[PDB]
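Predict the assembly for these two chains.
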Amino acid sequence: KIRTSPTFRRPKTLRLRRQPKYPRKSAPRRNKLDHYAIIKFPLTTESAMKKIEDNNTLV
RNA sequence: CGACUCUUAGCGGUGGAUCACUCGGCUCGUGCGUCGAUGAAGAACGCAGCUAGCUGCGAGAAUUAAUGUGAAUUGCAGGACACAUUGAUCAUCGACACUUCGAACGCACUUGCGGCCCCGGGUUCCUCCCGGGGCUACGCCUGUCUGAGCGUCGCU
């Protein structure tokens, strides 16, 4: 070809995607952050009830 | 007289010696002689109906399953187990599960910021938003692919 720059750069090559012969872990881990784990229990304090009545917010 | 002071004895007290005890040590001896990227040791934070610490455990958290055992656990309560339409408790333990750091592994140590490939929901191939899953560290070995070289050459 032709060289127009005095700098030699590392030529770009081919990079294959991973095609494993086996998965390293047998199964995906179960998501232990479901809806039941997110909500633990409501608050029932005096401040909490004031938000339910005067603010339309659950705590 | 008393008070005060001294001594002795009795009894009572500031005190915890002595004696008796010991699920603890120390020493000797015997048999084994086994950790970890399939993530160790060590940390952190959590987990009980009432439970702070010790202990045990890991979001299935003072435990699940299985086997053996065979009627308890216990401080209170509650309800199992009808005590074979097979099972309380305990032991054993080979199945399952095992949060965050840590050799610690996408980059960085602040609950900071990414990238690639998939899945679900809003919209519909904006992959734009949210949620989830799998990968994404260094060194090094065999092989594989893609390359470089006025390195040595061959055919042109």
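The radius of gyration of chain A is 30 Å. Residues 8, 10-18, 20, 23-25, 28-29, 31-33, 37 of chain A lie near RNA strand B (CB under 10 Å from a C1').
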